[PDB]
Design a protein around this ligand. Structure first.
Ligand SMILES: CC[N+](CC)(CC)Cc1ccccc1
Ligand SMILES: [Mg+2]
Ligand SMILES: [Mg+2]
Ligand SMILES: [Mg+2]
Length: 340
């Protein structure tokens, strides 16, 4: 049961939740990876890792993924959360030097992950381990695009560092552009392809219906995170959240801002339902009779299915994960699972 201010009946009724059969193993393997790569303190992994639900979130998303592919995606996903925590703590403690160095190392590791598998910074070595494995599934053309996309994500984190250091809250439109990067829209979109076993040609994945379906899936996920993570983020002096930009620049009250974010999230859903029809008509057009057309048709169909699955996975993740349960913390500004 979800709180009325967070509840989305259309999700509950029309996007039934899915779970990949590898999830029980996935849960433990990622937990152990976090442990052995020293990405989270050992006692924090035992106390909090399972309750954080990072593996549940990916296992509800990339349905159909080879077990190995889902494992690398889940390790990378968990790493991303730990990176978000590190970024947060570097900002809070004014470690601009340590953040700048991490940022540079991540850019280099991204292009040559093999070189960085045993780097002395365990956050960098962990990144490189997951990225090296992601690079093993599809041609190097897909790897180059993932890298291009993630260099942009790191730089958006650097922009957030600048904003929070200066006490700047982005305008609403500026925020919406930044959020496509800090949420890593195009990374989750990229990872649809190794999950269905096919790198999509530019002409296919840039078709308007595929692009728009892919975008709305991510806008929904990012803004729903904004809605649900607003309490802990206000508490932690986070300034990046659609709700916070509206309060700051459109002078809404908190209640008005929650309402406005809800309405924007709702519209993503019914916009997605419209363009999903087009995206699936496109998948049928790809099935032209040929082997390649059938491969491409099947892959777009799977990808669009998972774009849909993201809605329910993200929806339930925010109600299940301890990441957001600020009311339970001794210090509302310092989550228990973060290394402070
Ligand atoms: C901070 C984590 N993340 C990706 C794991 C940043 C790129 C956004 C996110 C939050 C909640 C659900 C899904 C993604
Ligand atoms: Mg963040
Ligand atoms: Mg965050
Ligand atoms: Mg958030």
């Amino acid at each position: 049961a979800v709180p009325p201010s967070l509840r989305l009946p259309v999700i509950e009724a029309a996007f039934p939740r899915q779970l990949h059969p590898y999830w029980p193993k996935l849960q433990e393997t990622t937990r152990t990876w976090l442990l052995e790569k020293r990405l989270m303190p050992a006692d924090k992994v035992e106390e909090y890792a399972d309750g954080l639900c990072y593996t549940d979130l990916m296992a509800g998303y990339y349905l159909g993924a080879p077990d190995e592919v889902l494992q690398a995606i889940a390790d990378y996903s968990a790493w991303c959360f730990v990176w978000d925590d590190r970024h947060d703590r570097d900002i809070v403690h004014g470690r601009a030097g340590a953040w700048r160095r991490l940022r540079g190392l991540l850019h280099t590791a991204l292009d040559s992950p093999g070189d960085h598998l045993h780097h002395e910074d365990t956050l960098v070595a962990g990144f490189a381990d997951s990225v090296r494995r992601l690079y093993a599934f599809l041609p190097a053309t897909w790897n180059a695009r993932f890298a291009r996309h993630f260099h942009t994500v790191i730089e958006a984190y650097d922009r957030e560092f600048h904003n929070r250091t200066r006490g700047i809250v982005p305008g609403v439109e500026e925020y919406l552009e930044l959020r496509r990067l800090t949420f890593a829209h195009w990374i989750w979109t990229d990872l649809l392809e190794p999950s269905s076993g096919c790198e999509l040609p530019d002409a296919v994945r840039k078709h308007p219906a595929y692009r728009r379906a892919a975008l709305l899936s991510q806008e929904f996920a990012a803004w729903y995170n904004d809605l649900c993570s607003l309490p802990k983020e206000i508490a932690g002096d986070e300034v990046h959240n659609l709700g916070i930009s509206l309060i700051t620049h459109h002078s809404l009250t908190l209640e008005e801002a929650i309402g406005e974010v809800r309405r924007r999230v709702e519209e993503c859903i019914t916009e997605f339902l419209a363009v999903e029809r087009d995206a699936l008509r496109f998948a049928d057009e790809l099935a032209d009779g040929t082997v390649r057309g059938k491969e491409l048709s099947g892959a777009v169909r799977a990808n669009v299915g998972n774009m849909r699955n993201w809605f329910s996975s993200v929806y339930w993740f925010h109600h299940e994960s301890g990441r957001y349960m600020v009311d339970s913390w001794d210090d509302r500004s310092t989550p228990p699972y973060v290394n402070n």
